[PDB]
């Protein structure tokens, strides 16, 4: 420090000295706080000693640990029964909030089972799901950041209805934590699945079309209840996913986040006739789990419509045409597939196909079509869920 | 030895040693916290000294301190006027939140006056009460722990309506901080008063029936909107209160938490007739601030009903019967007490009593009855408040 002249008199107080004193006081306060923390720890230890009182002073094993361990295993076998066991035996309190804290901690818990339980339509489960999402702190996180945390805590159920409940809870929570970002919960929900599809698109090699940042901006046009979201916001989300894929717990490689494919496609194919086996070039549109085909790209009405429900694909070698596969019903051998087409006179009639043999222009287009068709068939209930949700997202005047 | 009344034993039955140690540790922690607060205050003073605006002063106390001191005294005289003085003179900002912070700090404030002010039905006061409970951090505290903090910050008003507002604010805050614990705010509210009655029961010597942990579990059956709360939860609450009574600020010994008696009782008594002074044994039920008496325990209809409104008790010596007291109206000497009874023919008529002389089977039963009756009369508006609240608690499925 050095000293000051001090001609003035004994009342002269020195700011530096006062500051130093203040610092010392602060240090003392910190020490006191540390002491308090230590005391708290001691108290906790005492409580532990008290609890499991009827025992031998030195016991080999831990009552609490043993009982909780068995309860967790019970939960993994049947979540309803596990929760019940833990509540009955006072290892867990009975409120939705306490159950949610148990699930969020998730120690020794199967995260798929967590997802199965949180996605149930029961009133208790609904309340646990709310408290569960409330344990996720979404304020000041972008949508991908929030999704990363949420998707670490459980594994998405397979049932479309269950996936919906959980993503609705997520979207509602995000919007409450980040007001003014999205115009509606519906916007947040649909954008969330856009992000999930992008994760699949960019990180699964079975997906050839790798969307650019500009492309992802264009795909989400009108999502904000008719309006567009800020380009900067969409870019940040795109770049986060591009940089790092969703990290999934207990990952089996089969997760929706990695295998959420676009079920829609358009393009030229040759198709073999039903009763009369002639090859025809047609413009095909795969949409709504149906294969629509047209004589010309300018036709308003399809030449035919093939519902894909209950069908599967097999590759075939054809004597004349390259890159062939067949659609067929594996349950109904030798039976006509339910479909409709238009005759030359304009009459709409039933198709006469036991199989639909299709030839693609290239091996690469063959693979694209088979992927799209398989994806469309395999996740239809889920794509239907999103489609019904997207309609309410789009607003008509 | 020998003492006059039957309520002084020896200290032999102690509590559990570990628990006592924990309590001591908690006390130490509290002391440390107080020390830290003092240090902080000192630091603030040092900062003020360092600061430029602070001149050397001829005066013992400074402008801010002097003005705030007078304002606090004004508040204690008339809370509305005190707040106004502090706001007008820029010693306190005008929002409910700032006023609530002033009240919560409570420096040099009468905590009874704090309670009077927070319990007012005015719109501003209602908003201050909300902000006041928001300054209490109830997350991860059990209901007793939260009650201890809340009941340190102010003294409960005497008006039933005011008590209701404050306990409603408390219960709502607790449930928001601890979601899923109680099924309703009503559950939290009624359980809170169960805890308060237990405090009186276990810690006031005028109360002979000391409920066990099992007893307290049984008393709260169906409280959770028809359902039962977890036995472990109720045990923790019971043991906390048993171990340590509610610590009340500026304690005069007259606080509700110490003098919240059960106003209800049943049992055998002899009663002296009205016009014709014959002694009859009757089964008595004290409920709803009324004394109902029956010829037989199996009777559906009472022999008579004595409203206790406006009555008081005096002990008397009787020539024939032991352990006697009289109910009488001190305002209406020599006048018949409003009551009803049934004649032998079944006609319901008015009673002819100037006084009701009652004889109890033992001195101990006499004391129990007089306590119950006095308690019932003295706090009727409040018991009525709880009763109307408990009805909405009991719901049908
Ligand atoms: O045009 P020609 O050479 O006469 O042969 C037709 C076309 O291949 C039709 O295809 P498209 O409808 O695309 O024109 C086909 O109908 P499908 O669409 O049902 O395959 C007819 O099947 P049958 O009606 O089953 O013979 C087949 O007779
Ligand atoms: O039975 P007997 O010996 O004839 O005397 C009766 C009983 O004592 C009654 O008590 P209870 O009603 O409990 O049977 C009492 O009524 P109260 O209930 O009003 O005390 C009558 O009072 P009067 O009616 O005031 O005389 C008194 O006449």
Numbering used by the authors:
A (entry chain A), B (entry chain B): 3 to 399
From the paper:
Cytohesins comprise a metazoan Arf GEF family with four mammalian paralogs (Grp1, ARNO, and cytohesins-1/4) that function in receptor signaling, endocytic trafficking, and cell adhesion/migration (Chardin et al., 1996, Fuss et al., 2006, Hafner et al., 2006, Hickman et al., 2018, Ito et al., 2018, Kolanus et al., 1996, Li et al., 2012, Mohanan et al., 2018, Ogasawara et al., 2000, Rafiq et al., 2017). All cytohesins share a common architecture comprised of a heptad repeat coiled coil (CC) domain, the Sec7 domain, and a pleckstrin-homology (PH) domain. The PH domain binds phosphatidyl inositol 3,4,5-trisphosphate (PIP3) and/or phosphatidyl inositol 4,5-bisphosphate (PIP2) (Chardin et al., 1996, Kavran et al., 1998, Klarlund et al., 1997), with affinities, specificities and spatiotemporal distributions dependent on splice variation in the phosphoinositide-binding pocket (Cronin et al., 2004, Klarlund et al., 2000, Ratcliffe et al., 2018). Two autoinhibitory elements, the Sec7-PH linker and C-terminal helix/polybasic region (CtH/PBR), strongly suppress GEF activity by occluding the active site in the Sec7 domain (DiNitto et al., 2007).
To address these issues and gain additional insight, the structural organization and extent of conformational variability of Grp114-399 dimers was independently investigated by single-particle NS-EM. Unsupervised reference-free classification of ∼10,000 manually picked particles from 500 micrographs yielded 53 good quality classes representing ∼6,500 particles. Attempts to generate a 3D reconstruction with visually selected particle classes were unsuccessful, suggesting potential conformational heterogeneity. To explore this possibility, the 2D class averages were systematically compared with 3D volume projections over the range of possible views for each model in the MultiFoXS pools. The 2D analysis suggested that conformational similarity of best scoring models might improve selection of classes for 3D reconstruction. For two class sets corresponding to compact or intermediate best scoring models, 3D volumes could be built and refined. Automated docking of the MultiFoXS pools with the refined 3D volumes selected best scoring models having relatively compact conformations similar to the more compact models in the six-state MultiFoXS ensembles. The low resolution of ∼53 Å for the refined 3D volumes likely reflects conformational heterogeneity in addition to negative staining. Flexibility in the CC-Sec7 linker is the main source of conformational variability, with a secondary contribution from hinge conformers that does not appear to be strongly influenced by dimerization. Although the analyses are most consistent with an antiparallel CC topology, the resolution is not sufficient to definitively exclude parallel or mixed topologies.
